[PDB]
Every structure is written in structure tokens, then in C-alpha cells.
Design brief:
This is part of a larger assembly, with four copies of chain A, one copy of chain B (about 210 residues) and one copy of chain D (about 220 residues).
Chain A lengths: L4 E4 L10 E5 L5 H5 L7 H7 L4 E3 L3 E4 L2 E3 L7 E4 L2 E6 L15 E6 L5 E3 L13 E11 L6
Parallel strand pairs in A: 5-8
Antiparallel strand pairs in A: 1-2, 2-4, 3-4, 6-7, 7-8
Chain B lengths: L3 E4 L2 E4 L5 E7 L7 E6 L6 E5 L3 E2 L7 E6 L2 E6 L8 E7 L6 E2 L3 E5 L7 E5 L3 H4 L3 E11 L5 E6 L2 E2 L4 E5 L9 E10 H6 L2 E7 L7 E6 L3
Parallel strand pairs in B: 2-11
Antiparallel strand pairs in B: 1-3, 3-8, 4-5, 4-9, 5-6, 7-8, 9-10, 9-11, 12-13, 13-17, 14-15, 14-18, 16-17, 18-19
Chain D lengths: L2 E5 L2 E3 L5 E8 L8 E6 L5 E7 L6 E3 L8 E5 L4 E6 L8 E7 L14 E2 L3 E5 L8 E5 L10 E11 L5 E4 L8 E3 L3 E2 L5 E10 L2 H4 L3 E6 L4 E6 L4
Parallel strand pairs in D: 2-11
Antiparallel strand pairs in D: 1-3, 3-8, 4-5, 4-9, 5-6, 7-8, 9-10, 9-11, 12-13, 13-17, 14-18, 15-17, 16-17, 18-19
Classes of the chains: A mainly beta (about 140), B mainly beta (about 210), D mainly beta (about 220).
Protein name (chain C): Spike protein S2'
PDB class: viral protein
Keywords: Fab, viral protein
Chain lengths: ~140, ~210, ~190, ~220, ~280, ~140
């Protein structure tokens, strides 16, 4: 067994807690790869625990699996996406530092919808919007 | 150096409730923090050392925890004895520093103050000055406002006030306000009034007297 | 200027000055909505456009991240040059990475061998760099052609292609300069 | 009984010097660091100075550095603090406390034992006995209600002052307010007690004022007009 | 006991000046957030008596990072070498009150060597007059003498001020010295913060050193070889020792060429990312 | 994705030292392929992901007589995929699926009969696609 190791981290400005993805491996090999039994108890925590999530891509450690689906912040692979989220309850407070954590979940395709299809009905908009969006394209390289 | 900042500066809780005072160091002290209890005019007593070790003979109600830079002293079941100012200190590095101090007070039902006004004694007048005193007796909470009026004129810069420590039995506070004036000034005016506002009072209490009468 | 003043005509030939309100009326005509909609709602539409533009100022000002498409190009080239520059340091199996050293170090009969190692390697690195540039340049030129088409179709006129000019029934676009690239401020009609 | 008694407080003019001393008992004095901490009333507790068990190593807060010297006589079981160039700011209550060993470091226990304190006042004012004026009972209410009376102890320096009523006979309902430093620089305070209106005339009320620094004692009878 | 040596132990990897660039190098450094062993000095105490005077011999390993906060400069110097006994050359660095001398001789080391300044009762003076590192020496390869300097001779106890850090490594048989001295009066005892060490001296001795010992000093006490930590002891002082390990680091050179920060590459996965 | 070190040096200390002399060749190569990898994900997002919300068809098929049944996903079969597309998957040769290969099952001269396993041997790894097949179908369902 071998594979790539990719670190899923939020920006350093936000935090320094990370989650690691061991690509194309089973969770089993990571405790065996290093001698967890040999190591100190401080080291032992990292090998195994409830906080391990296994995915098709590999074994992701450091991220709690979540049922809820959200937009994909960072792509893991196999449809799993990781993000740094905390639920916050504070008055007039942005999500402040709290027990925050890194979560991994099946990336939400988006809010699912449905259309009331019928033989006899149409949906015609009453009002509209004039919007402006930005499309950016590179024109030229530096003339080296 | 390191600065320790406690919060809140003051708090009032009822008996039996849980109180939590926090202390925040400017930089990591590690475990080097201790807590002290101080009663009015008495010397401080050491409650906790190494952030969480109870000093011998200290009541078990007190406990202290901490991690990182932030530390907390909790009092599981507040008792009347507990009234005092509590200070955190960090022995981690020199110079040794104490926090500002948190004054704890026993919360009791609101009580209105009895108000009395005292005119200057004849003996005092013989000196130069006249001292008018206004006593506010046994009220809670501590916040109380006193305005002085000489023939319905507001007074400023001529008053001083003092407040007693919370009463042992009553858990109430008392306050004295003294208005000082020259003998000459005093003779000038007829009516001396003391106006008091407090949570306890639905309407203002004013006690007054006439100079000659 | 032509886009504001002349409508689409400035691409077709001599720019024919036309009053602006008249242009959008033609423009709305482009989507399948009659002229009356604009005038009947001219103030609000105008205001809505005005407020809309300001939003872009904030988004661009707020985050640089919007600019990633340009930034990576600059980043990539910088990286390519850095890598190209850094290669100079590699020994490539030669005793040393410095030409002047080798020259000072060895007589020609022996030196030729060592220098040769660097030349084959360094040239190969340079060869690698060039190939990358050609491929990368192709990508940019691909974008340029697209950019030209967008400028051609979107600026010069109202494009019919869905999702060419941005999500929605496209009104018009205002091209904007940028470093090593271009930015378009598409104005799109979206049903509310 | 581990005990620490401080002596030497008093009134001192600016520029003056004093030396306070703390006699210790109940433990092996030679083996421990001793410190001096001060509490200046408006401000808080402040750590003044520390001495190692050996007596050689000595540390001070910056404000005091030239001015104060801490020393100890183990045979004497006494600790001292000599102060110089006293400033008004040095006024405070000085406590001698037994400190922990710095070596403990991250696990420092802090000051285990403390003395009662010695009060030193730095002010230009001279010692002066208080004037005691009666606060006669005045109420605009029916009798039988409670009445308040008291004594005005004014213009004395330095603190402290002792106030008792009826020679300790009358405790309940007594409030002797903390003194305030007046603009003059002299101290003034009042002591009051609430009593039944019926008691006026029947009961004698004597306010006992004792000001040790001035060595004056006063007994004022408070009577209604 | 152990303390957290958060960031410290970084030094300029080479003589070369660099500016405004992030350069990566591999040398023997102190890994970040590594435990250091805290050694202590305790004055005589009550019956229990905490008193400690720790001068054990410690391992040289790859390299040692030594830091100390001294109430007074109790710690005069160090000893480096395998045996620390004669019949072999051993590095000896000691600073008398006057100057610093470095000497290779095959010294006859005392079982418990130390140095010292005695504090006189009559006057304030602190004077060093206890120097018992070795009985004798022979076949001395190299010796160096520094300039005069003034330090705290007298016995005092605590970690009030002086913070001194050193890095001792061997490079190609070279004995290297690095140092940084900053007062931590207000600063915490063994403080958290980052500082870079720069090379003071080069010692071309080429001594193979397995172990080293620190020599504490106080002249109030007399010394004889065979002195087993008896007699009076110096004021409280604490010193730390850590072990260097081969690790990669990314050093940040400021405009000045001063090393503002560093990243332990191996420390954690976050740190590894910074490395790439 | 390919690892230069294993590919060139595969478990040889004496080799890797020689590779270092080469300088930055590997880092760029690994970088180049990785750039390619992300691009593919970008390709799939851009192609399929055109719609924000994911639409689902109503239970009533009455499409004016137009018979969509073949094109719509067939709730039933594993993966809610359509009939016509189902054949499409069948016609092609999938490199591999499941992303899990028994290590032991693999070790000697026969496992390379299993080509992927052999590839697993020489540093050649296949990263999984970010958008899973099931996920891809949903878009195709929605766009439809």
C-alpha cells in the first residue's frame, strides 16, 4: 500500500487545524505503517479514533463525517468535500472562534428542486432584474 | 512584563448560585497562576495555587481551572461569607502581577433607603464652615444618587460621599453625603434639601429643612 | 464610446450616433421583449443598472480572488521563469554548477566534458520551458480568439448564444482593460 | 500559629524614610523567600519586593528601585523594608507575605501566609485631632418612628480613628462610614445609628471617638434639639 | 520536568547573506515544540529542603541547544568530550570574572567540577575565586582567551533577567558556537518568542564529543575534586538542554537579513504544506 | 498521476541521490500532471454543472405524446441512470472500478495479469474523478 498524502487545511489566517487525506489506502494500514503500539500515548491518538472517515478516495483523518450536504469548499474526491464550519450562537457575533472543526461530507449538488409540470399551466415572470456579472479571460502572456 | 486582567470587575449573585470569575494574561503564564481572597481591610488569603490546587484549609466550594492564557476561579455554591474581592496573580515571570480584582456581592431583594438630613451644629458654625449631612440608610442595590439643592439650586463640587461595606446581617449598604459651605455662604440661604433617587423608590425622596427654623 | 453612443453599428461600418435610451429599446428587442418595457420602466431600469455597476466595484475591491483567471497566468509565467532560472544552480552531474568556476577549475581537454554535461541538461531544461510556453500560449491564444469573439459578438453587438455573455438573455457588455488580459462587464436580463 | 506582624507604619512627609518590619513565627524563617506587597486603596494590590532564602538575591518593582531596600535577620526572625524618598504615591498598606519558591516555576503556589498590614501615609499634613460635632435627630414624621443620630468627626489626620457608641454598649444599627480625604487634605467621617424615637430622652447616646495618632479621646453626648 | 521550547533554536545556517527571500536548508536544529529538560538550582530550605544544584553530565548527541535564565550568572561554562577524564583531550570553556578562556588540554577533571564567585559580607563585591575544573592538564592543542567582561559573581537566586541561548554543533569535526542574549527581566522565564542566533566563534579543534556537562559556579564555596555537592550552594538558576535533529526548515530573511520567522517542516502536516 | 521518484528511482537510495542532481525536473512534471488533473475536473464541472439547482421530473409523464422514457433516469437500477446511457457505459472499457484492491491477493509473477495492480506497483496512480458517476447522472437528469 502507498498513495499520495494531501493536506486539507483552511487558510492559516482562519485556523491551523488540518485534516489529512491518505489517498487510495484503507484506514487499517495507517496504524501499522507507523508503530503506533511503539509510540507514546500522545502519538497514539493520531492513529485511530472515532474521528476517522473512510472514503473511496482514501482514508481521511482529522475530519468528522457529516450527514448534511453543503456546497463544496475544497474537493477531496469521490464527491466528498471538506470545509471548516462551526455553528455559532452569539448575539451580534459572526462565527467567532469556538469549538470549530473540519467536516467532510457528500458535496451537495445544490438545493434540489422540482418543477410543477402540467398539461395546462405556465410560469411567466412579472418582473425581472438587470444584473451585471464579470467574465475574465487572459489575453496575453508576458513577452519573454 | 505581563498584565493580568480580570472580568467582570464586579458581580452580584444570590446565595447558592455558581459564580465564575475569569482572568486573562497578556501572554502565556503557563500554570503559574494563583488566586487570593481579600475581605475589607483584611490581608489577602491564598485560595488556589498552580491554577487549580486548593490551599490548605480553604473551603472546597472554591475551585480553579485554566488552560492556555485564560484561567477561571469558580465558586460552586456562593455563601454569605464569600463577600470579598478576588484577585488572580501570575508567578510565571517577574515582575509578579495581580489582576484588578473582582468584587463579589451578595444579591438580595431590593430595599429602599431611609433618608435623614442633618443641619450643621451651632458648635461647628463657630468654625468657618458648615457641614450639611444626608444619611441614606440600609438600601440595596448599592447604586444610589444624591443631589443637593440650596434654595432649589443644584450644587456642584461641594459634596463628598462615602459608602459602607455590605452589611453582615442585612446585606444592605448605607451612604453619607456631606455638603460643605462657608459660614457666610450658609447664612445666605434658607432652604437646604437633599434629593435621593434609587431603584427602591417609586418617587423621589427629598428631605429638607429651613435655616432659622 | 461607440458602444454607448452608436449602438452596434460601429463594428458594421461608420458609427451612427444614437440616443442611449433608443439603444436598449433596440436591445430589449433582441431578447423578445418589446420596446415598451424599457421606457415604461426607464427610471428603475436605469437606476437598477446604475446600482448594479456599483456592486461590481465592491466585489472587485473586496476580493482579489475574482481575478484568479488573470492571476494564475501571471503566476504560471512567473513560476516558469523561476524554475527556468533555478535550473542554473543544478549540477547535472557536473562537478559544479558555475561555468566560470569550471573554466577556472579545469583545462579545456577535461573541462569540455563537464561543461557538456551542463549544456545538454540546461538546454534540455530550456527546451522543456519552451514547449510549455508554446502549449500554454496556445491556451491563451485560444482564449484570445474567444475574447475577440466575445468582443466581436458581445460588445459590438448583442449575442444570441445562451450563456455566451453570462447567465441569461444577454443585453450588452463593456470591455475593460486588465493586465495581460481583459474583463467584461456583461449586462444580462434575468427574470425576477 | 504561623504569624506575621508588621510594625512601623505612620505618617511621613515626602522625602522621608521609614522602615517597616515583619516578625515571623511558626515556621523555619531561614528557609523561605519573604515578600512585601502593598495595597494602595484606590489602586490595587502591588508586589513591592522579594528576597531569596539566602538573603542575597533581591528583587524590586521599578518604581521603588533606588528608594526601597528589603532585608532580613534570620536569627531575629525579622524581615525589613527600608524606604527612602517617600512620595505621596507610596501611601498604602504594606503586607509581609511568605512567598513560594520561584524555582517551582510553572507550578508556583503564590503567597501562602500574610500579615495584617502596616499603614504608611505620605502627606505634608501634620497630625491633628478631630473635631466632633453632633448630628442631632431631625425628622419630619411622627414619633415612635425610627430616628437617626450620630457624630461628625472632622478634620483629623492621619487615619485611623476609632468610633464606638456607649462604650461598645450599642452595636446594632451602627454605621461608621469610611473616612474621605477632603480637599484640605484632612480626613472626615461620620458615624450614625438608627434608634427608636421613643428612645430619645430616655436613652443616653454617647459617641466615643479615639484618635491614637493625635492621642486624643472624645466623648460627645448627642441629644435632640 | 520539561518545558515547552516553542520556537527557539534557530540560527543562520551559513555565512552567506540573503535578503527578502525564503530559503530552505537542512541542518541540525531543535525541532519545534520539543521537550527540553529543565535543570534547577535551589537554595537550602527548611527541613524538607528543595535545594538542588544540578550539574549532571548530559549527552552530546548530534548537537545541544542550551539556554539559561540566571538570577545571577551561576553557570560559568561547559565541558565537552567523551570521557571527561584525562588521557584524552577535552573542551573546557570557563569564564572567570575577568575573561573567557577556551582550552583543549587533557585536564584532570574533578568528580564534581564547578566554579564560583563568593559574596563578601563586609562589602558589596562579588568575586570569583573558585575554579576547580581540573587538577592538571597536559598536551594542550589549542587555547583562546577573550576580553574582559563583567557578570554577576555573587550568589542570588531566581530567573529574573538574563536570558542566554546557545547552540553547540559539530560541523565536519568543527565545533561551532552560536549565541543570542536578551534580557527577560519583564520577559517570562524561558519565554515564548522567536529570536535568531548568530555565530560568535569558530573552534577548529575537531574533538569527538559524546557527552558534555555544565559547570555551575559560586566562590562562596571552596572546591576539591571529590566534592560531592557539599558545602554552600549558589543562587537559584535554571538552564535547559535540548537535542538537535536533522530536519528541514524554511527560513525567512527580512530586508535586513535578519531571520524573523521559521517553519519546522516535519512538525505537522500544516507545517509540511508551508514547506512545499 | 505519476511519482517521479518511484518511477525513476523506485525504492533506491543510491538512485534518488542521482536524481537530485537533476534539480527541479520532477517537481515540474508532477506539477504538470496535477495541473492536468484539476483541469479535467474543471472540464466536467463546466460541461455538466451549467445548472445551479437540481431538477427532478414529476411522476406524470404526459409530455404531449412525446416518449422520453428511454432518456430519463430509471429509478430502479442501481444508480439512477437512463436506459440509453446504460448501454453507453456498457460499450466502453472502464479502466477499473471500486478503487479497492486486495493487497495480499496481489504479491509475485500473475497479479500483473491485473494491469491496474501492476500500475499500482510503479508509482502509477489513478486519481478518482471528483464528480462521481452517480453524481454525473443527476446533472444529466437535471439538464434533461
Amino acid at each position: 500500500s502507498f498513495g499520495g498524502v494531501s493536506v486539507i487545511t483552511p487558510g492559516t489566517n482562519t485556523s491551523n487545524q488540518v485534516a489529512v487525506l491518505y489517498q487510495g489506502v484503507n484506514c487499517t494500514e495507517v496504524p501499522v505503517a507507523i508503530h503506533a503500539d511503539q509510540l507514546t500515548p500522545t502519538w497514539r491518538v493520531y492513529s485511530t479514533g472515532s474521528n476517522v472517515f473512510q472514503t473511496r478516495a482514501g482514508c481521511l483523518i482529522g475530519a468528522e463525517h457529516v450527514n448534511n450536504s453543503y456546497e463544496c469548499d475544497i474537493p477531496i474526491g469521490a464527491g466528498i468535500c471538506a470545509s471548516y464550519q462551526t455553528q455559532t450562537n452569539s448575539p451580534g457575533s459572526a462565527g467567532s472562534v469556538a469549538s470549530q472543526s473540519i467536516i467532510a461530507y457528500t458535496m451537495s449538488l445544490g438545493a434540489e428542486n422540482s418543477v410543477a409540470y402540467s398539461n395546462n399551466s405556465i410560469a411567466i415572470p412579472t418582473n425581472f432584474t438587470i444584473s451585471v456579472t464579470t467574465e475574465i479571460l487572459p489575453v496575453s502572456m508576458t513577452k519573454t | 512584563d505581563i498584565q493580568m486582567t480580570q472580568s467582570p470587575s464586579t458581580l452580584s449573585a444570590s446565595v447558592g448560585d455558581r459564580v465564575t470569575i475569569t482572568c486573562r494574561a497578556s501572554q502565556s503564564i503557563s500554570s503559574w497562576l494563583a488566586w487570593y481572597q481579600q475581605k475589607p481591610r483584611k490581608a489577602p488569603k491564598l485560595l488556589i495555587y498552580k491554577a487549580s490546587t486548593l490551599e490548605s484549609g480553604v473551603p472546597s466550594r472554591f475551585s480553579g481551572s485554566g488552560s492556555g492564557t485564560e484561567f477561571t476561579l469558580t465558586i460552586s455554591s456562593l455563601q454569605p461569607d464569600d463577600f470579598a474581592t478576588y484577585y488572580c496573580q501570575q508567578y510565571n515571570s517577574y515582575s509578579l502581577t495581580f489582576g484588578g480584582g473582582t468584587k463579589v456581592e451578595i444579591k438580595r431583594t431590593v430595599a429602599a433607603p431611609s433618608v435623614f438630613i442633618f443641619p450643621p451644629s451651632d458648635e461647628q458654625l463657630k468654625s468657618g464652615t458648615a457641614s450639611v449631612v444626608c444619611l441614606l440608610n440600609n438600601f440595596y442595590p448599592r447604586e444610589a444618587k444624591v443631589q443637593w439643592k440650596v434654595d432649589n439650586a443644584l450644587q456642584s463640587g461641594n459634596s463628598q460621599e462615602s459608602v459602607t461595606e455590605q452589611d453582615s446581617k442585612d446585606s444592605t449598604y448605607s451612604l453619607s453625603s456631606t455638603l460643605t459651605l462657608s459660614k457666610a455662604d450658609y447664612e445666605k440661604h434658607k432652604v437646604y434639601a437633599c434629593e435621593v433617587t434609587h431603584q427602591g423608590l417609586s418617587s423621589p425622596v427629598t428631605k429638607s429643612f429651613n435655616r432659622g427654623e | 464610446a461607440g458602444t454607448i453612443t452608436s449602438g452596434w453599428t460601429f463594428g458594421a461600418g461608420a458609427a451612427l450616433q444614437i440616443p442611449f435610451a433608443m439603444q436598449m429599446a433596440y436591445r430589449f428587442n433582441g431578447i423578445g421583449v418589446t420596446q415598451n418595457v424599457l421606457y415604461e420602466n426607464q427610471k428603475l431600469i436605469a437606476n437598477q443598472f446604475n446600482s448594479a455597476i456599483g456592486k461590481i466595484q465592491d466585489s472587485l475591491s473586496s476580493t482579489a480572488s475574482a481575478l484568479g483567471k488573470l492571476q494564475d497566468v501571471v503566476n504560471q509565467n512567473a513560476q516558469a521563469l523561476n524554475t527556468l532560472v533555478k535550473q542554473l544552480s543544478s549540477n547535472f552531474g557536473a562537478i559544479s554548477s558555475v561555468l566560470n568556476d569550471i573554466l577556472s577549475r579545469l583545462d579545456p581537454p577535461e573541462a569540455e566534458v563537464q561543461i557538456d554535461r551542463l549544456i545538454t541538461g540546461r538546454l534540455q531544461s530550456l527546451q522543456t520551458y519552451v514547449t510549455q510556453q508554446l502549449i500554454r500560449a496556445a491556451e491563451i491564444r485560444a482564449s484570445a480568439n474567444l475574447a475577440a469573439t466575445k468582443m466581436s459578438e458581445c460588445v459590438l453587438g448583442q449575442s444570441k448564444r445562451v450563456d455566451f455573455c453570462g447567465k441569461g438573455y444577454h443585453l450588452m457588455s463593456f470591455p475593460q482593460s486588465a493586465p495581460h488580459g481583459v474583463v467584461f462587464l456583461h449586462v444580462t436580463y434575468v427574470p425576477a | 500559629e504561623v504569624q506575621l506582624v508588621e510594625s512601623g507604619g505612620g505618617l511621613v512627609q515626602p522625602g522621608g524614610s521609614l522602615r517597616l518590619s515583619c516578625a515571623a513565627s511558626g515556621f523555619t524563617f531561614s528557609s523561605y523567600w519573604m515578600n512585601w506587597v502593598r495595597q494602595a486603596p484606590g489602586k490595587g494590590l502591588e508586589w513591592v519586593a522579594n528576597i531569596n532564602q539566602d538573603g542575597g538575591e533581591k528583587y524590586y518593582v521599578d518604581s521603588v528601585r533606588g528608594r526601597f531596600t528589603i532585608s532580613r535577620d534570620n536569627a531575629k526572625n525579622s524581615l525589613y523594608l527600608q524606604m527612602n524618598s517617600l512620595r505621596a504615591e507610596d501611601t498604602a498598606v504594606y503586607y509581609c507575605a511568605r512567598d513560594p519558591y520561584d524555582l517551582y516555576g510553572d507550578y508556583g503556589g503564590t503567597f501562602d501566609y500574610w500579615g495584617q498590614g502596616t499603614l504608611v501615609t505620605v502627606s505634608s499634613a501634620s497630625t491633628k485631632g478631630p473635631s466632633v460635632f453632633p448630628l442631632a435627630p431631625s425628622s419630619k414624621s411622627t414619633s415612635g418612628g425610627t430616628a437617626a443620630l450620630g457624630c461628625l468627626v472632622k478634620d483629623y489626620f492621619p487615619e485611623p480613628v476609632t468610633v464606638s457608641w456607649n462604650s461598645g454598649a450599642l452595636t446594632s444599627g451602627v454605621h461608621t462610614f469610611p473616612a474621605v480625604l477632603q480637599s484640605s487634605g484632612l480626613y472626615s467621617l461620620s458615624s450614625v445609628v438608627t434608634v427608636p424615637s421613643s428612645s430619645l430622652g430616655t436613652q443616653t447616646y454617647i459617641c466615643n471617638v479615639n484618635h491614637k495618632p493625635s492621642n486624643t479621646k472624645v466623648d460627645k453626648r448627642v441629644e435632640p434639639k | 520536568a520539561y518545558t515547552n521550547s516553542f520556537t527557539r533554536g534557530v540560527y543562520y545556517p551559513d555565512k552567506v547573506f540573503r535578503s527578502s527571500v525564503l530559503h530552505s536548508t537542512q541542518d541540525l536544529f531543535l525541532p519545534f515544540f520539543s521537550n527540553v529538560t529543565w535543570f534547577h538550582a535551589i537554595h537550602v530550605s527548611g527541613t524538607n529542603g528543595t535545594k538542588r544544584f544540578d550539574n549532571p553530565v548530559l549527552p552530546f548527541n548530534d548537537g545541544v541547544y542550551f539556554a539559561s535564565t540566571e538570577k545571577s550568572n551561576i553557570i560559568r561554562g561547559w565541558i565537552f568530550g567523551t570521557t571527561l577524564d584525562s588521557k584524552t583531550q577535552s573542551l573546557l570553556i570557563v569564564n572567570n570574572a575577568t575573561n573567557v578562556v577556551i582550552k583543549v588540554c587533557e585536564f584532570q577533571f574533578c568528580n564534581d567540577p564547578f566554579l564560583g564567585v563568593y559574596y563578601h559580607k563586609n562589602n558589596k563585591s562579588w568575586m570569583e575565586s573558585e575554579f576547580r575544573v581540573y587538577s592538571s592538564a597536559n598536551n594542550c592543542t589549542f587555547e583562546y582567551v577573550s576580553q574582559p567582561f563583567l557578570m554577576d559573581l555573587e550568589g542570588k537566586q531566581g530567573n529574573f533577567k538574563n536570558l542566554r541561548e546557545f547552540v553547540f554543533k559539530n560541523i565536519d569535526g568543527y565545533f561551532k558556537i552560536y549565541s543570542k542574549h536578551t534580557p527577560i527581566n519583564l520577559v517570562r522565564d524561558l519565554p515564548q518568542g522567536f529570536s535568531a542566533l548568530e555565530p560568535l566563534v569558530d573552534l577548529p579543534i575537531g574533538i569527538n564529543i559524546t557527552r558534555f556537562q555544565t559547570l555551575l559556579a559560586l566562590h562562596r564555596s571552596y572546591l576539591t575534586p571529590g566534592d560531592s555537592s557539599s558545602g554552600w550552594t549558589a543562587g537559584a538558576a535554571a538552564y535547559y538542554v535540548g537535542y538537535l535533529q536533522p530536519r528541514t526548515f524554511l527560513l525567512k530573511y527580512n530586508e535586513n537579513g535578519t531571520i524573523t520567522d521559521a517553519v519546522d517542516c516535519a512538525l505537522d502536516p500544516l507545517s509540511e504544506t508551508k514547506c512545499t | 498521476s505519476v511519482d517521479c521518484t518511484m518511477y525513476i528511482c523506485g525504492d533506491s537510495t543510491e538512485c534518488s541521490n542521482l536524481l537530485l542532481q537533476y534539480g527541479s525536473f520532477c517537481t515540474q512534471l508532477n506539477r504538470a500532471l496535477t495541473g492536468i488533473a484539476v483541469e479535467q475536473d474543471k472540464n466536467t464541472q463546466e460541461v455538466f454543472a451549467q445548472v445551479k439547482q437540481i431538477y427532478k421530473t414529476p411522476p406524470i409523464k404526459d409530455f404531449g405524446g412525446f416518449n422520453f422514457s428511454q432518456i430519463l433516469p430509471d429509478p430502479s437500477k442501481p444508480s439512477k441512470r437512463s436506459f440509453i446511457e446504460d448501454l453507453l457505459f456498457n460499450k466502453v472499457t472502464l479502466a477499473d472500478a471500486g478503487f479497492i484492491k486486495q493487497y495480499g491477493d496481489c504479491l509475485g509473477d500473475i497479479a500483473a495479469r491485473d494491469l491496474i495492480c501492476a500500475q499500482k506497483f510503479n508509482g502509477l496512480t489513478v486519481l478518482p474523478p471528483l464528480l462521481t458517476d452517480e453524481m454525473i447522472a443527476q446533472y444529466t437528469s437535471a439538464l434533461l
